Amino acid sequence: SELLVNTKSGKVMGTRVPVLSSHISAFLGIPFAEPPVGNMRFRRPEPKKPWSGVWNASTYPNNCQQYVDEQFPGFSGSEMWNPNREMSEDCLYLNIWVPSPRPKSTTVMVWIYGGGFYSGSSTLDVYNGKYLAYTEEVVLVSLSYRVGAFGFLALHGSQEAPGNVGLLDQRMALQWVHDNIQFFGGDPKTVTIFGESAGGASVGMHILSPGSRDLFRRAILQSGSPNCPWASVSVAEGRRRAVELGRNLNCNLNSDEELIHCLREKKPQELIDVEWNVLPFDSIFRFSFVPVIDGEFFPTSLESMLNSGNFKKTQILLGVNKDEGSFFLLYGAPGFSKDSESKISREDFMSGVKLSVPHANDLGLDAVTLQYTDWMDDNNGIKNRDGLDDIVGDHNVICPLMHFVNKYTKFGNGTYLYFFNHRASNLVWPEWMGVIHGYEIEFVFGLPLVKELNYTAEEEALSRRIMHYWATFAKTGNPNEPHSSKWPLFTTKEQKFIDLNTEPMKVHQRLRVQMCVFWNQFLPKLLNAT
Amino acid sequence: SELLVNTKSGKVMGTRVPVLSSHISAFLGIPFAEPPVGNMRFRRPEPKKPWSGVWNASTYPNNCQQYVDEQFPGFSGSEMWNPNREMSEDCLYLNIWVPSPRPKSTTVMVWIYGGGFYSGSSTLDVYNGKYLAYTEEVVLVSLSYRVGAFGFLALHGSQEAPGNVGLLDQRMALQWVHDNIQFFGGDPKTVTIFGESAGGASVGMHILSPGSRDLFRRAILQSGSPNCPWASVSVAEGRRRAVELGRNLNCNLNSDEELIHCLREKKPQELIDVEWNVLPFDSIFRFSFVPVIDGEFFPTSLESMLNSGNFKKTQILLGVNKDEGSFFLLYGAPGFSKDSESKISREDFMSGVKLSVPHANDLGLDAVTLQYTDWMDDNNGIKNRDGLDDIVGDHNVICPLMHFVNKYTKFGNGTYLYFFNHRASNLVWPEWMGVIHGYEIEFVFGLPLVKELNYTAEEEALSRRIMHYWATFAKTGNPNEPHSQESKWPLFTTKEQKFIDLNTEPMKVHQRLRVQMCVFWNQFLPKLLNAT
Ligand SMILES: COc1cc2c(c3oc(=O)c4c(c13)CCC4=O)[C@@H]1C=CO[C@@H]1O2
Ligand SMILES: COc1cc2c(c3oc(=O)c4c(c13)CCC4=O)[C@@H]1C=CO[C@@H]1O2
Ligand SMILES: *[C@@H]1O[C@H](CO)[C@@H](O)[C@H](O)[C@H]1NC(C)=O
Ligand SMILES: *[C@@H]1O[C@H](CO)[C@@H](O)[C@H](O)[C@H]1NC(C)=O
Ligand SMILES: *[C@@H]1O[C@H](CO)[C@@H](O)[C@H](O)[C@H]1NC(C)=O
Ligand SMILES: *[C@@H]1O[C@H](CO)[C@@H](O)[C@H](O)[C@H]1NC(C)=O
Ligand SMILES: *[C@@H]1O[C@H](CO)[C@@H](O)[C@H](O)[C@H]1NC(C)=O
Numbered sequence A: 001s002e003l004l005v006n007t008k009s010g011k012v013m014g015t016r017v018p019v020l021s022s023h024i025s026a027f028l029g030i031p032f033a034e035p036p037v038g039n040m041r042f043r044r045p046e047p048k049k050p051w052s053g054v055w056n057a058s059t060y061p062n063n064c065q066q067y068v069d070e071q072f073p074g075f076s077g078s079e080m081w082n083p084n085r086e087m088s089e090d091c092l093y094l095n096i097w098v099p100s101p102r103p104k105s106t107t108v109m110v111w112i113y114g115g116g117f118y119s120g121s122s123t124l125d126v127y128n129g130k131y132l133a134y135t136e137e138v139v140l141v142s143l144s145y146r147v148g149a150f151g152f153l154a155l156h157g158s159q160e161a162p163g164n165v166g167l168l169d170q171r172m173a174l175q176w177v178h179d180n181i182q183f184f185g186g187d188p189k190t191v192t193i194f195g196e197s198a199g200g201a202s203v204g205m206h207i208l209s210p211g212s213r214d215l216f217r218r219a220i221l222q223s224g225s226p227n228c229p230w231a232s233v234s235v236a237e238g239r240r241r242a243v244e245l246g247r248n249l250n251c252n253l254n255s256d257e258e259l260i261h262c263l264r265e266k267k268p269q270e271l272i273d274v275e276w277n278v279l280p281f282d283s284i285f286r287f288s289f290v291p292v293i294d295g296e297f298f299p300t301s302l303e304s305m306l307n308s309g310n311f312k313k314t315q316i317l318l319g320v321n322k323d324e325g326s327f328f329l330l331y332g333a334p335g336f337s338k339d340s341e342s343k344i345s346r347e348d349f350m351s352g353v354k355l356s357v358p359h360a361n362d363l364g365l366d367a368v369t370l371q372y373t374d375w376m377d378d379n380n381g382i383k384n385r386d387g388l389d390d391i392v393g394d395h396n397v398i399c400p401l402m403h404f405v406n407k408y409t410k411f412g413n414g415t416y417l418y419f420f421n422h423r424a425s426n427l428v429w430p431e432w433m434g435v436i437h438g439y440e441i442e443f444v445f446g447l448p449l450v451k452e453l454n455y456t457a458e459e460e461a462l463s464r465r466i467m468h469y470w471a472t473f474a475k476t477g478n479p480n481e482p483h484s485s486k487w488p489l490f491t492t493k494e495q496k497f498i499d500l501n502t503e504p505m506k507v508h509q510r511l512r513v514q515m516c517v518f519w520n521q522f523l524p525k526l527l528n529a530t
Numbered sequence B: 001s002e003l004l005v006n007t008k009s010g011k012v013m014g015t016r017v018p019v020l021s022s023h024i025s026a027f028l029g030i031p032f033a034e035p036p037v038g039n040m041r042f043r044r045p046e047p048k049k050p051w052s053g054v055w056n057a058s059t060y061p062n063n064c065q066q067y068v069d070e071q072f073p074g075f076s077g078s079e080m081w082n083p084n085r086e087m088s089e090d091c092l093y094l095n096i097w098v099p100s101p102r103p104k105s106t107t108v109m110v111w112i113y114g115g116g117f118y119s120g121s122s123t124l125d126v127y128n129g130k131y132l133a134y135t136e137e138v139v140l141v142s143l144s145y146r147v148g149a150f151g152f153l154a155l156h157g158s159q160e161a162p163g164n165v166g167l168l169d170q171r172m173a174l175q176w177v178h179d180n181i182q183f184f185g186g187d188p189k190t191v192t193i194f195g196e197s198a199g200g201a202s203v204g205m206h207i208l209s210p211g212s213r214d215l216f217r218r219a220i221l222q223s224g225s226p227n228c229p230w231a232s233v234s235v236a237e238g239r240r241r242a243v244e245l246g247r248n249l250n251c252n253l254n255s256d257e258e259l260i261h262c263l264r265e266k267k268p269q270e271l272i273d274v275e276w277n278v279l280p281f282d283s284i285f286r287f288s289f290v291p292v293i294d295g296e297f298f299p300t301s302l303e304s305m306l307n308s309g310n311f312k313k314t315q316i317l318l319g320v321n322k323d324e325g326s327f328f329l330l331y332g333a334p335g336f337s338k339d340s341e342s343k344i345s346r347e348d349f350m351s352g353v354k355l356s357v358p359h360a361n362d363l364g365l366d367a368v369t370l371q372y373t374d375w376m377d378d379n380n381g382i383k384n385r386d387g388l389d390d391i392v393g394d395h396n397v398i399c400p401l402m403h404f405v406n407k408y409t410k411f412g413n414g415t416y417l418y419f420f421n422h423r424a425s426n427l428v429w430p431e432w433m434g435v436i437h438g439y440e441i442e443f444v445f446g447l448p449l450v451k452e453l454n455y456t457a458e459e460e461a462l463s464r465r466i467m468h469y470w471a472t473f474a475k476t477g478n479p480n481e482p483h484s485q486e487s488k489w490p491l492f493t494t495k496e497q498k499f500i501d502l503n504t505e506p507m508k509v510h511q512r513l514r515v516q517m518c519v520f521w522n523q524f525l526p527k528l529l530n531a532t
């Protein structure tokens, strides 16, 4: 009844789930597209054909085919991000948490997972929607989308592997929410999309893309923006990588069509085993198959779109963590370790800036180096480690987001900026890594509310503050509830943002302005010039 | 007879001068070269021909022909640097202060004035040698040399205007000291050369130049070094400037000989009037006629000599003042004034940067701007004013000196480095200007020892220890008296890079003087400008 919902493509049977000494409705693994399998691998998604009988939506779906991180087997900090379900190319499903009793026509929030466009699943423990749905009385959807080659292999000109299909999967799940969320007590005219890292880049891509604009009301971007240097490639670079993928797998390369058909015969894991090989450099925070600037999903370059105001004009709320870079150093840079303080020698710092800014010539490397080195104390391994962490975080996440926020604000209808800098109580990773990539997510999804998870009282209270900011923003375009201490609008002139931690709200201005002028104005001009 | 000296070119009669209620001997205006006048303008100097009779050396000589600053008429802060004598091309003279009674074979110090190679005089109040010679028992000499076109017009290939003749004037006075100072009870094997700004750059050029090396024992450089961006030009640029000078005066330019002949027939003032017109750019801290890298006085590039250790190996003492740039902003950059706190707008900061680094491409200007701008507070008038001051000082004096001292220390026999950061209590310049270019000189020359000049007792104590450092260094190669219980000025070393503050407070040792900004100026900027 409450659990039996007739949607436009057929009937779905949800399940009653327990949540914090209460209950709500969960509809898990709802198909939004035809399975993109067989001759459909690499192609645009097709809408899910209607089924008869009742779809069993009591259970999480398969995760998409992806690289699986095995660097630290057994370790919760890496393993929480890996698939917790069987992987299958048949993976285009969404999940819904509905407050019980069913609300009339409430704010909808649609979560878009990150994972670098090469991994991610809607079914991770940290994305369990039941807490945010219950606490904030919203309808929470998590979508999925193809990642890696399967989602982003790009041979522009071909209708067979056009590129961007993972982005179209997201848009098709959005369309499905627009067409069906009213059946779950959701208001399709009050949809917020939100996601982290690649999911945040994704959110900003749908703001930019004219085909996505009318499928949501408002947006939240966490530690990601569309212009991130790792978040897109040119059609020529996507093409090179796709030919190199085929080269790796002994494919016929005489034609797009021959390459594409060879690659469709390959077992999924065969694609995944060689995925990292197509990258043009030794690097970190670079992923193989990502969105392409194709002239279709994105009519023109992201920069020209941002400058002309060719994008959705609405309210956005976005921000970054203190130490975005540290996870990536740990994986790919010399001298770093999970099990030590990771004091970085000068030799390893040099080799790290090269890996961090793989597109830089020698002059740009020197420029980066000079900008983050304290020459009164250059053999300090602690300042060398933190310096590298800041390079990776500033270059890849913070400064692109600041460029996006400054460009967006000129045209949009209200910007709210945050700086997430809370030090964990349950320290999973070592201290040197600080406020890690993805850590704010636990707070957004209300995991600190679960007593069995052993967060502190101050963390429960912060999670509740964050959920309420997020949901209130989703409802109104403003994270603040009229009447009382206010998170102020980010404005072009004043550039105010807030810290998000367990202390009373403090307001600052010009987040990392000094390093971000280096990354957004001077380096690009140096690289354009030399 | 103490006052009557027979030198190698003739007799000299000096004068008993009073000093701090004692007396010493002064020999003022001794000629060391033929008057470089007439057909000798621009030529290498020639040794002074022996004269008959007794040379009256009781009064200061003429000052060399030079641009005279009159931005601030009647103002002692600018006017103290202008010629206080009649100007003449007949100007190659030296001055000597000798303790009374005459010492046997004592330490010699020889002062080389600054003034950007376009100005300066041995006769200024602030260079009065009597305080230092008396107090430290040293034989103190001040030399002179031709400045501006007269000293530095450079037409490489001609032996009529070869360039660097002002440096050869200095060499010749050094040679004269070498040959004659024994007659004044000086030891010619213990000569320290010292000078400020262009004077300091000159000292460094003598260190480098094979033809000067054997003419002094060791060297002090104040706020200047040979590698300063303003202190030299290429043969090509010297030539361009000499020809631009001709063009300004409607000279015949068809050949060097015609150009030089034309320029020799002009009155000195005609050259001076257009002197500033030959500079390639609108600029700050740039001077028209300066030493040229010729392949003679300088066998190869300053940088290649410094790297190979092709230069005099000895002891050096050197340093800088806290605000080297301020004087130069006052004169040429927009929004500066001596009668206001000179809060600088963003727009005038951008203009100042361009004037300060006139050789820079757009990208280079951007790097300078970025390196010196607080983007949390980019409209701060005070931070923009100080930023500009730091740029001008870091680029023109501090970072070149630091590059020099690092390069020198690899091969030399002892380096002592100072940072002078005392602002004098009786300064007539506004506070914003801080510790100005040239203002350590009066301490070096012991002016705070005169009660009527109204310095503090702390300023007197400071001047006494500066003079004692300088002279003790001149005597021994080490500013410290061994066995003394005093705070010790440590050697500057490649590894530790130590220096001292010189001020009215107890001594503090620091390390890596302005290392952050000087890596930018000495490594990153040139690499960037050299890029295309
Ligand atoms: C096999 O090489 C890589 C493996 C890898 C990553 C990588 O992230 C990167 O940014 C990156 C590489 C990575 C190789 C080159 C590169 O840039 C993820 C980080 C954490 O887990 C993921 O596992
Ligand atoms: C006519 O232009 C100038 C006059 C001038 C100076 C200058 O110093 C400079 O560094 C400079 C100029 C100067 C013009 C261009 C330049 O760089 C001395 C400063 C103070 O007194 C001197 O007088
Ligand atoms: C849906 O699946 C679960 C187990 O996978 C089962 O317990 C539930 O009853 C199913 N619903 C059906 C078969 O109608
Ligand atoms: C949003 O648009 C409204 C309605 O036109 C307008 O009043 C206001 O200027 C905008 N709000 C912001 C914060 O830009
Ligand atoms: C959390 O705390 C409980 C109660 O003290 C304890 O029994 C348990 O070991 C902790 N759980 C986890 C998953 O760390
Ligand atoms: C030398 O010149 C001075 C000053 O003009 C004069 O007073 C003095 O009498 C002269 N001495 C001799 C010996 O002629
Ligand atoms: C200077 O030279 C002498 C003679 O070789 C040597 O003993 C001394 O160590 C040198 N001192 C320095 C500080 O280089």
Ligand SMILES: [Cl-]
Pocket (backbone or CB within 6 Å): A018, A019, A020, A021, A450
């Ligand atoms: Cl629960």
Ligand SMILES: [Cl-]
Pocket (backbone or CB within 6 Å): A409, A490, A491, A492, A493
């Ligand atoms: Cl605004």
Ligand SMILES: [Cl-]
Pocket (backbone or CB within 6 Å): B018, B019, B020, B021, B450
């Ligand atoms: Cl007196």
Ligand SMILES: [Cl-]
Pocket (backbone or CB within 6 Å): B409, B492, B493, B494, B495
């Ligand atoms: Cl050493």
Ligand SMILES: [K+]
Pocket (backbone or CB within 6 Å): A160, A257, A261
């Ligand atoms: K085909």
